[PDB]
């Protein structure tokens, strides 16, 4: 079964790394901003084989009139935000949930907190502290998910791969 999955979210949240770590079991060298890339993976979820078409989108605001072109016939959306960027988190409800629902009213949304490894990280906590900012907790993620009518909230690290397979397993489970 062919399943189309589109990934959106603010620039630098870890969309590309998420997709490349999942499909190749390797974390990308540098940070090259995505224009548009196309990945695929053969998955087995609950006894079913699936062709998972993964569509990587640009998080830069410049591509606002270009991004909705990826949206038709989408089976499941991943809206991504960094657990370590409150700003990216606020934009889940301010930008990404509205943009997805204006074009795809019904398509299931999975909300995905990325960079889980960085949540308990010393340098990062302290760097957010100096701006009177704090990492996004799990309860807040779940409330945001309910807020945007997401079908699942999941947390993962593209770096350690912690929670990474479940993201896509649940993405497929929201279509099936
Ligand atoms: N610690 C940590 N860093 C991560 C993780 N995922 C991505 N990063 C870092 O975050 C930066 C952005 O990653 P990237 O996947 O390119 O984000 P993006 O959402 O694709 N950006 P764009 O919208 O511009 O394409 C990179 O420096 C990358 O190494 C993660 O799970 N943990
Ligand atoms: Mg990218």
């Amino acid at each position: 079964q062919a399943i189309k999955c589109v990934v959106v979210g603010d620039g630098a949240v870890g969309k590309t790394c998420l997709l490349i770590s999942y499909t190749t079991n390797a974390f990308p060298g540098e940070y090259i901003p995505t224009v548009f890339d196309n990945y695929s993976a053969n998955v087995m979820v609950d006894g079913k084989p699936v062709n998972l078409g993964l569509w990587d989108t640009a998080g830069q605001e410049d591509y606002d009139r270009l991004r909705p072109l990826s949206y038709p016939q989408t089976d499941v959306f991943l809206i991504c935000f960094s657990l370590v960027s409150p700003a990216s988190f606020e934009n889940v409800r301010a930008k990404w949930y509205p943009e997805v629902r204006h074009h795809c009213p019904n398509t299931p949304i999975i909300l995905v907190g990325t960079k889980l490894d960085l949540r308990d990280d010393k340098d990062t906590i302290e760097k957010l502290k100096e701006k009177k900012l704090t990492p996004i907790t799990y309860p807040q993620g779940l409330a945001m998910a309910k807020e945007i009518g997401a079908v699942k909230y999941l947390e993962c690290s593209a770096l350690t791969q912690r929670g990474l397979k479940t993201v896509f397993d649940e993405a497929i489970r929201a279509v099936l």
Side-chain angles (χ1 to χ4, degrees), residues 12 14-17 31-35 37 56-59:
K15 300 186 290 293
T16 292
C17 288
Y31 166 51
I32 302 160
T34 313
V35 183
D37 293 82
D56 196 13
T57 68

Side-chain angles (χ1 to χ4, degrees), residues 2-75:
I3 290 176
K4 182 182 174 177
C5 169
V6 176
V7 188
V8 302
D10 289 354
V13 302
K15 300 186 290 293
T16 292
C17 288
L18 177 88
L19 293 171
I20 292 180
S21 185
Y22 177 65
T23 55
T24 64
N25 296 342
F27 194 83
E30 219 55 61
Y31 166 51
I32 302 160
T34 313
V35 183
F36 184 74
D37 293 82
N38 209 260
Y39 307 100
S40 60
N42 294 12
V43 205
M44 284 223 67
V45 174
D46 310 324
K48 270 183 158 60
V50 167
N51 264 118
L52 189 60
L54 289 166
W55 297 51
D56 196 13
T57 68
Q60 290 172 78
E61 69 165 45
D62 283 311
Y63 300 87
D64 278 3
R65 266 203 177 183
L66 293 163
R67 199 183 304 101
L69 299 169
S70 305
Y71 292 5
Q73 270 93 343
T74 301
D75 291 298

Side-chain angles (χ1 to χ4, degrees), residues 6-16 18-19 31 33-35 55-64 67 71 77-82 85 87-100 109-114 148:
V6 176
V7 188
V8 302
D10 289 354
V13 302
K15 300 186 290 293
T16 292
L18 177 88
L19 293 171
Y31 166 51
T34 313
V35 183
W55 297 51
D56 196 13
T57 68
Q60 290 172 78
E61 69 165 45
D62 283 311
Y63 300 87
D64 278 3
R67 199 183 304 101
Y71 292 5
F77 279 89
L78 306 179
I79 296 175
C80 295
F81 72 90
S82 179
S85 166
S88 74
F89 176 73
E90 162 69 20
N91 281 343
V92 167
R93 62 149 154 196
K95 194 186 174 185
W96 301 116
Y97 158 70
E99 186 184 296
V100 165
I109 293 168
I110 307 304
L111 177 66
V112 181
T114 65
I148 70 158

